[PDB]
Amino acid sequence: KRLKVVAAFQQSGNSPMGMVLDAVPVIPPELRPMVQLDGGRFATSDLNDLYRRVINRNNRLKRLIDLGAPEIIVNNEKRMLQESVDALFDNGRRGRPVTGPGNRPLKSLSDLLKGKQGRFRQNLLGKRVDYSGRSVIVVGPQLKLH
């Protein structure tokens, strides 16, 4: 059972250190847009909140280390940072997911590819098209077959 994974990493030349992240990417803004509805009320995707947490706990850590706080605080900060990143990638893989406003879980990146809604399930169900219409039918007996 182990040899399959070990050989998978043994092949293709690529190193296994990719499983630890020294930096994480940020999705372009318009894929997680902030839009003001009619009347001035704003609507925003959940992603730009998850990222925010990762930005917060990281910065505090970069501050906390500078002043040399005891390890009891620095290690808790590191645990928080890692938990925030984990929730950003796959919310709910840790346990009870983060919820934020209301009492609904926040959609992570993986949730945009995993469930019924996503670019791997919803994409194959077709798309709405222009130059199209719909209407009820009646029998035309005088029509030719074509």
Binding site: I72, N76, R79, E83, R94, G95, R96
Partner: peptide, 24 residues
Amino acid sequence: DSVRAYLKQIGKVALLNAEEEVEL
């Protein structure tokens, strides 16, 4: 909730008495 680890870890150090704070 998983804040219990922090509560446990900080729970291994006893509180200071009035005279220890000045010493520290």
